Design a protein around this ligand. Structure first.
Ligand code: ATP
Ligand code: ZG7
Ligand code: MG
Lengths: 341, 150, 150, 300, 151, 502
């Protein structure tokens, strides 16, 4: 219905633009590029000639390894194309994959754009364990000047406090977040499913908005509950230096009381954690398989450093035993393959 | 002919009940008291709907493949050893919850299979009806007022 | 031998004239059990207890008894390839006995003979029997009788 | 029409209702095979309900309404009666037999016997009517059974808090369970049967050695005998929890005693071969570990 | 058509009344009933079976044993054999022919079955794995006059 | 520590070793001794443990101890996954014994309900003992969810330090000494994982198995050390070279299981020759040689003489040869050199093991072989031989082993257990003066041998679903006569004596 607010030739193109503008936000980057290239093929194969189809099919077969041929580009079609072929001869894949996206000429909807545009009270942003969409909500709820409850789903008392805050916050109208809904899914199907599955009235639509944090890798959420709520995937990956500043910023909250050398050791631990986390994303190259690393490893490594520094003289000696301890107990615990060790 | 209502979207089992009123018994092949209550129902002449069609219980075959040993005064059917009298007014419906459920070939060749299953090809039917609703309100008005005034 | 090579007819003729070798016929299929074999034997056979031979199983008379176990290579083996009934028959030849598992005592067999009959293992659905079993038998081949003799 | 043909068979069936009755050890007679009659009752109730959709029954109804009103109360008494049966038969094997367990709980058994008498009255009187349907005409039967199962439930609730408090006194009893603890409490006078459970509530030791007056020590599952320093006294006015708690602390103190004694001997230049035949394994292991790390600290 | 032609021949008809819960024990009672009628009552029954009725392979194994011979030993095992023997003695002696030893009467029995029992298999779709197993079974295949009532 | 360069490696090594100190000024005797490792401390509890079995100290065992004390230092629950057979619970129990604690093990899903599990959790939460959840992945989803909730309450009460916690809606005190450990069998989508609620409260470890040189050296140190390092190196190199040159056969198993068997066979043979390399050579030729084929026997000989040549002529070369020839003559057999060789081989092998496996083609002569050896023994030793022959796959497991009835508890012994009962309880007849030969002549599979696996283990016990353990005497020996090992595990093969009739 949104498409309205050569007639066929216009409304069809604006429909392709509307489909990519709306459903791409609920998909990850890989499926975003799959949908962009595909839909582009479904639009261009019917309008243009067969030569255009044959050229695009042979270029996709050169990006893949199905069939590799280098036909004539077409005649005087160099302006329309030859750029993906130019990206092919240079063996560059990011520009060639983003060319199909630049072709849509669609402002890629940010999570702020979907939350502002859509008129619904339930949203679920599932993501990998690498990142968390909470920090995005911190700025987005502050920009909307709402509030942002962060109700952690912990024990039975946490569950009771969660349902109490839900039943009050919907009346007050403040935004709430439910971190890690996957672990309390058993409680979800009993209470939360029945609670938010059926819409009640406009009383909650005017003020109240609810958010749920899920994880892509993990248990499957119920189908009626997932269909009722809008879906987003927070896929914003921060930089290495940015993660270093984020880890360094957290250190002076609690404070350091051991000594000045412990500060230097903590700085080294922050760089080490950011570099392992940087190597984590690269699964085929680098780490043999994908290992998930949390801040608990940062905590255990920090406590081991304070324990060894509190009982040892200021000489350069403990660097012999700290390294093995980290690579075998703190971080080498999850790793099973010796190559990654 | 026994209708077989294939609607995953449960709804038919309500419209039927809203039509026939209080005399709609609802049954199931998985309710293990089924056989005696079904026997009882046909003796009473109730309307019956049976849930979970992707199951069948061959004893019911004589209701499906119409057969009734004729009597003079009455009309009787062996639902097992139970030589049951048919109260005339009886009506059997079967329902089923999913097309991935297999239909035994015995049923599938006697019973009137009907699908209420939502079909994507409703996009093809409906989006034109909305395209014209935003293209020409007056002609889509004429398209309906012609036949209804007629 | 192939299907219809007078495999049974030859046995039946040879032994019908004879007064010494009576016949039991046991036609196997996909899932025959050893209990079926013992149930077949029960009508013709008798059991006697002896300390020296534990439970002797003679036949219920003075003759000899031939178990014609037809289609012996069809019983469906388990996934490891073990077809337990062929092993049981191996036990009957090689060991002259078997274990009686409700009693947990050994049974020695007295005068019972085994005859197999089979259609070649290359035919559809046939199972290659264990060599450890087949090693005990004098295998013969029969073929169709040349057309002219027919 | 067929309405009559069905009511006839229903009434025919219900004028033949018999219950299998068999008497257990004490005077009371238990009833066997509840499910047949109950299932028939429920089946006939659904048929009587379904008889309301017919058209040829309007004038033909009143009789069937009386029949329905009878069968509904029949099922009402059915449920409560089977529940009473089950709960009494369960509490009987716990309280109706032992003398020590009822000496510990005089009130609940004092009530149990008073319940058993009335139950005997009702059951005998009910069985001798010779028609299971006519039982509903016996006065005060539904309310009787209602208050009887209420009293049984109260007794059974009481029967569990005493055990839970006994578990709170000695937390090893959590491993045992209800049945074994009941035998330990009843058989506390005899004192030998507790030894079988000792492997469960300890895990290391196997049996307890006696000298018919006191506990000299205990032996493990391997066969090694442990001798206690302080012998445990036994008297008539004692509970299992008391001497069991004293035993629990005493074995730990005796382990420490032989450990410091072993360490003192090993410090006094002794052979390991003479010590092994005299002290337990655990003491010589720890004393050897302490002396080994002590000598290797200066060796470093 | 089979019921019609049975009616023409004055055969009794049998159709097993099996459903979602009938088991081997029940199908065993059916067959013992049928065989007793065919022999003791001489009733000449056309036993009509459809593939839908053999919802497990044990029924098919039994039908192989039946058509391969003219009996199921398991149906007449133990004390039931002795009872059966008594009935047959009585039966034979009721007809005035006298046989003494068990073998003679059992041969008579089996021959009477072999002439008084007619089994008819309908099969709706040959390509079903069960149907394929019934066609491929040698005990069935080497007895049944296969006829195609195709389409 | 002696081989370290300076004090730096010595202190690095000493930090990892468990140090047992004592407090002199304690006056709190039960709390006197404490254990220091890598800087963390742990109080020794004076709980009686009896005489428990001790694991071989290996580097990976100390790494597992370091992971446990590291998690306990921060009051975190311990848990480690890995393939089965690496000693997860044995490590946890050994960790408890080292501190004088009896770890209560909870066996799960083996028709194990949830009521009694909660009763054990409340009791261990009061006593302050240590609980280990052995193989936690095999659980039902409803029971696993409720138990995981209870574990979450326990660990959160430990981390925060609450004295009283609400478990089973029951208020109960919490002693600070309780700890919970979770061992995880390997999954089927990969390695099994924990539920999401428990991930932020436990510390996962990758537990596997060790290599071979170190353990080989340690065992050689036990048996008599002379040249422990060189002998271990030569044995490992010899096994690697055998795996290198010998044909790729299915039943070939040259892993650590095989070398532990070779060393356990070397132990009683040292008493015959001495703590030299010659004993190792003879053990290898007793164990490995009968399992190799004609094509591989010469490979074995060549590589053996290559890496180390020790002796030339064996003992017991003639009285047994005579008795065998007499036995074969009584049977009317021709005493071929191959038959003689295999008879003597089998005769020697059966001296130190009870589970024999004889493999070959149908008609090889294996049954004649073992019966002739039995008769020869009956002559030479003067002991009797009782033989039972069980064509086991004709029987069901239930007809062989026992079972439970419909509701009655009465136990059907099953054939193999009933005969074992007779072999032990009888105490009338010369079974103690007899060799008892129970032959399982059939193709063997995993399911049946799994139901009796503890007989192949060093336990030498038949374990039964009935909960009873039947210790087997030395008189009892078992022969799996068969023609193939395709569906047999290496775990079983390495506990048996294998004889390949080439
Ligand atoms: N020592 C011997 N001297 C002469 N002939 C022998 C000797 N040993 C075996 N044979 C012959 O080889 C035959 C086959 O060996 P055997 O009977 O032991 O079969 P098997 O190896 O046990 O095979 P299966 O696996 O089939 O049981 C014997 O029947 C015998 O005739
Ligand atoms: N009548 C008859 C009959 C004959 C004939 C025959 C041939 C030669 C002679 Cl001298 C006399 C008669 C009439 C042509 N062949 N024939 C068989 O081949 C049989 O073979 C079997 C047996 C069991 C399983 C399978 Br599969 C096949 C069984 N019966 C017969
Ligand atoms: Mg053999």
């Amino acid at each position: 219905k949104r498409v309205f607010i050569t007639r066929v030739d216009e409304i069809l193109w604006l429909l392709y633009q509307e489909v990519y503008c709306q459903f791409s936000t609920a998909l990850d980057k890989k499926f975003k590029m799959i949908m962009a290239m595909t839909m582009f093929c479904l639009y261009k194969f019917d309008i243009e000639s067969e030569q255009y189809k044959e050229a695009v099919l042979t270029m996709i077969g050169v990006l893949s390894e199905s069939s590799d041929g280098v036909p004539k580009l077409t005649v005087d079609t160099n302006d329309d194309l030859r750029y993906l072929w130019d990206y092919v001869t240079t063996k560059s894949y990011i520009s060639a994959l983003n060319w199909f996206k630049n072709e849509f000429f669609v402002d890629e909807w940010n999570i702020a754009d979907v939350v502002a545009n859509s008129e619904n009270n339930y949203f679920t942003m599932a993501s990998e364990r690498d990142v968390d969409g909470t920090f995005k909500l911190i700025e987005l709820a502050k920009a909307s000047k709402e509030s942002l409850k962060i109700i952690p789903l912990g024990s039975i008392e946490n569950l009771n406090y969660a349902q109490e805050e839900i039943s009050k916050s919907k009346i007050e109208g403040g935004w709430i977040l439910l971190q890690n809904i996957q672990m309390s899914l058993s409680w979800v199907k009993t209470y939360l499913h029945k609670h938010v599955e059926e819409t009640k009235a406009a009383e909650e639509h005017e003020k109240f908005k609810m958010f749920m944090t899920c994880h892509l890798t993990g248990d499957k959420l119920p189908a009626p509950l997932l269909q009722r709520t809008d879906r987003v995937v927070y896929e914003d990956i921060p930089g290495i230096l940015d993660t270093v500043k984020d880890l360094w910023g957290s250190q002076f909250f609690t404070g350091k009381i051991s000594g000045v050398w412990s500060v230097y050791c903590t700085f080294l631990l922050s760089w080490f954690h950011a570099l392992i986390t940087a190597r984590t994303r690269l699964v085929p190259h680098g780490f043999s398989k994908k290992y998930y690393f949390n801040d608990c490893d940062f905590q255990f490594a920090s406590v081991y450093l304070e324990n060894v520094l509190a009982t040892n003289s200021t000489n350069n000696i403990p660097w012999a035993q700290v390294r093995d301890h980290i690579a075998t107990i703190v971080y080498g615990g999850k790793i099973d393959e010796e190559k990654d060790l | 002919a026994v209708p077989f209502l294939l609607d995953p979207s449960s709804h038919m089992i309500t419209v039927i009940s809203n039509y026939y009123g209080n005399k709609t018994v609802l049954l199931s092949f998985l309710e293990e008291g089924f056989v005696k209550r079904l026997e009882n129902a046909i003796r009473f002449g109730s309307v019956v709907i049976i849930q979970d069609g992707e199951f069948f219980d061959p004893i019911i075959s004589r209701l499906i493949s119409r057969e009734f040993n004729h009597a003079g005064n009455r009309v009787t059917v062996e639902i097992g050893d139970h030589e049951v009298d048919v109260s005339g007014d009886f009506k059997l419906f079967i329902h089923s919850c999913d097309p991935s459920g297999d239909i035994p070939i015995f049923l599938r060749s006697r019973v009137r299979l009907v699908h209420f299953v939502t079909n994507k090809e409703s996009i093809e039917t409906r989006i034109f009806d909305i395209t014209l609703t935003e293209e020409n309100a007056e002609m889509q008005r004429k398209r309906e007022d012609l036949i209804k005034l007629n | 031998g192939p299907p219809g090579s007078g495999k049974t007819m030859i046995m039946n003729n040879a032994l019908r004239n004879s007064s010494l070798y009576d016949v039991v016929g046991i036609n196997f299929s996909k899932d025959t059990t050893t209990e079926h074999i013992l149930s077949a034997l029960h009508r013709h056979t008798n059991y006697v207890t002896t300390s020296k031979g534990l439970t002797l199983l003679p036949k219920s008379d003075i003759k000899n008894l031939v178990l014609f176990c037809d289609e012996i290579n069809l019983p469906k083996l388990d996934k490891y390839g073990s077809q337990n009934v062929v092993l049981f028959l191996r036990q009957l030849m090689e060991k002259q006995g078997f274990w009686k598992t409700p009693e947990n005592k050994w049974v020695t067999i007295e005068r019972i003979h085994i005859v197999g009959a089979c259609n070649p293992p290359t035919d559809p659905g046939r199972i290659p029997m264990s060599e450890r079993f087949t090693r005990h038998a004098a295998i013969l081949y029969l073929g169709y009788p040349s057309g002219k003799s027919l | 029409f067929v309405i009559e043909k069905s009511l006839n068979r229903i009434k025919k069936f219900w004028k033949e209702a018999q219950y299998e009755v068999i008497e257990h050890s004490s005077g009371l007679k238990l009833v066997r095979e509840w499910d047949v009659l109950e299932q028939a009752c429920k089946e006939d109730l659904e048929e009587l309900v379904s008889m309301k959709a017919s058209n040829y029954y309007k004038i033909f109804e009143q009789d069937c309404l009386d029949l329905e009103s009878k069968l509904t109360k029949l099922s009402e008494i059915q449920v409560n009666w089977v529940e009473v049966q089950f709960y009494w038969l369960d509490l009987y094997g716990i309280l109706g037999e032992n003398l020590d367990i009822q000496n510990f709980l005089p009130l609940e058994t004092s009530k149990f016997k008073s319940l058993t008498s009335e139950y005997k009255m009702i059951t005998t009187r009910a069985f001798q009517l010779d028609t299971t349907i006519e039982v509903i005409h016996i006065p005060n039967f539904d309310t009787t059974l209602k208050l009887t199962i209420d009293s049984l439930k109260m007794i059974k609730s009481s029967l569990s808090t005493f055990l839970e408090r006994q578990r709170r006194q000695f937390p090893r009893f959590y491993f045992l369970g209800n049945d074994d603890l009941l035998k330990i409490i009843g058989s506390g006078k005899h004192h030998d049967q507790v030894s079988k459970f000792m492997k469960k509530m300890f895990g290391s030791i196997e049996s307890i050695i006696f000298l018919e007056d006191f506990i000299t020590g205990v032996r493990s599952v391997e066969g090694e005998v442990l001798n206690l320093n302080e012998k445990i006294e036994l008297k008539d006015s004692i509970q299992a929890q008391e001497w069991l708690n004293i035993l629990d602390t005493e074995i730990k103190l005796s382990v420490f005693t032989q450990f410091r004694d072993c360490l003192g001997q090993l410090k006094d230049g002794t052979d390991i071969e003479v010590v092994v035949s005299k002290y337990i394994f655990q003491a010589i292991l720890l004393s050897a570990q302490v002396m080994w790390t002590e000598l290797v600290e200066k060796c470093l | 058509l089979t019921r019609f032609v049975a009616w023409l021949n004055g055969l009794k008809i049998v159709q097993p009344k099996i459903h979602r819960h009938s088991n081997l024990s029940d199908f065993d009672m059916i067959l013992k009933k049928a065989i007793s009628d065919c022999s003791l009552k001489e009733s000449r029954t056309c036993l009509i079976i459809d593939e839908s009725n053999i919802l497990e392979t044990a029924f098919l194994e039994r039908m192989n044993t039946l058509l391969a011979n003219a009996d199921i030993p398991d149906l007449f095992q133990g004390e039931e054999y002795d009872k059966l023997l008594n009935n047959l003695r009585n039966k034979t002696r009721s007809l005035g022919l006298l046989l003494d030893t068990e073998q003679e009467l059992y041969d008579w029995f089996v021959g009477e079955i072999a002439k008084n029992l007619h089994v008819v298999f309908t099969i709706c779709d040959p390509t079903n794995n069960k149907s394929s197993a019934m066609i491929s079974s040698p005990a069935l295949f080497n007895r049944c006059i296969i006829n195609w009532m195709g389409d | 520590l002696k081989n370290c360069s300076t004090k730096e490696e010595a202190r690095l090594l000493w930090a990892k070793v468990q140090k047992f100190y004592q407090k002199n000024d304690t006056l709190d005797d039960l709390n006197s001794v404490f254990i220091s490792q890598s800087g963390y401390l742990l109080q020794y509890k004076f709980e009686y443990i009896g005489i428990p079995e001790r694991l071989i100290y290996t580097p990976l065992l100390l790494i597992g101890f370091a992971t446990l004390t590291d998690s306990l230092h921060q009051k975190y629950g311990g848990c480690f996954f890995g393939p089965a057979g690496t000693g997860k619970t044995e490590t946890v129990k050994a960790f408890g014994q080292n501190l004088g604690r009896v770890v209560v093990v909870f066996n799960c899903d083996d028709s194990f309900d949830y009521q009694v599990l909660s009763r054990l959790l409340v009791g261990i939460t009061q006593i302050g003992a240590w609980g280990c959840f052995d193989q936690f992945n095999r659980l039902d989803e409803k029971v696993l969810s409720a138990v995981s909730a209870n574990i979450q309450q326990i660990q959160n009460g430990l981390q925060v330090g609450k004295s009283h916690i609400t478990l089973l809606e029951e208020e109960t005190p919490l002693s600070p000494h309780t700890a919970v450990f979770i061992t995880l069998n390997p999954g089927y989508n990969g390695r099994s994982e924990l539920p999401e609620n428990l991930k932020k409260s436990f510390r996962e470890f990758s537990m596997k198995s060790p290599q071979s040189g170190t353990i080989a050296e340690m065992i050689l140190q036990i048996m008599g050390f002379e040249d422990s390092k060189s002998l271990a190196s030569k044995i490992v190199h010899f096994l690697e070279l055998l795996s290198s040159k010998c044909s790729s056969m299915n039943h070939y198993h040259f892993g650590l299981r095989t070398l532990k068997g070779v060393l356990r066979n070397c132990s009683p043979l040292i008493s015959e020759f001495g703590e030299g390399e010659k004993t190792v050579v003879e053990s290898l030729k007793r164990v490995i040689l009968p399992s190799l084929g004609d094509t591989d026997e010469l490979v074995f000989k060549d590589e053996l003489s290559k890496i180390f040549d020790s002796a030339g002529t064996p003992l017991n070369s003639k009285a047994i040869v005579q008795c065998l020839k007499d036995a074969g003559q009584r049977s009317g057999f021709s005493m071929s050199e191959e038959f003689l060789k295999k008879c003597m081989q089998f005769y020697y092998m059966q001296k130190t093991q009870q589970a024999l496996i004889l493999v070959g083609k149908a008609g090889c002569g294996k049954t004649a072989t073992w019966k002739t050896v039995i008769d020869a023994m009956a002559i030479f030793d003067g002991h009797a031989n009782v033989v039972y022959v069980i064509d086991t796959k004709v029987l069901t497991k239930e007809s062989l082993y026992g079972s439970m009835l419909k509701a009655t508890l009465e136990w059907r012994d099953g054939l193999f257990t009933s005969i074992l009962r007779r072999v032990n309880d009888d105490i009338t007849g010369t079974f103690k003066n007899s060799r008892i030969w129970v032959v399982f002549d059939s193709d063997l599979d995993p399911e049946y041998v799994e139901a009796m696996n503890s007989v192949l283990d060093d336990n030498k016990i038949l374990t039964l679903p009935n909960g009873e353990r039947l210790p087997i005497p030395p008189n009892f020996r078992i022969l799996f006569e068969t023609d193939n090992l395709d569906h047999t595990t290496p775990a079983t093969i390495t506990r048996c004596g294998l004889l390949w009739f080439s």
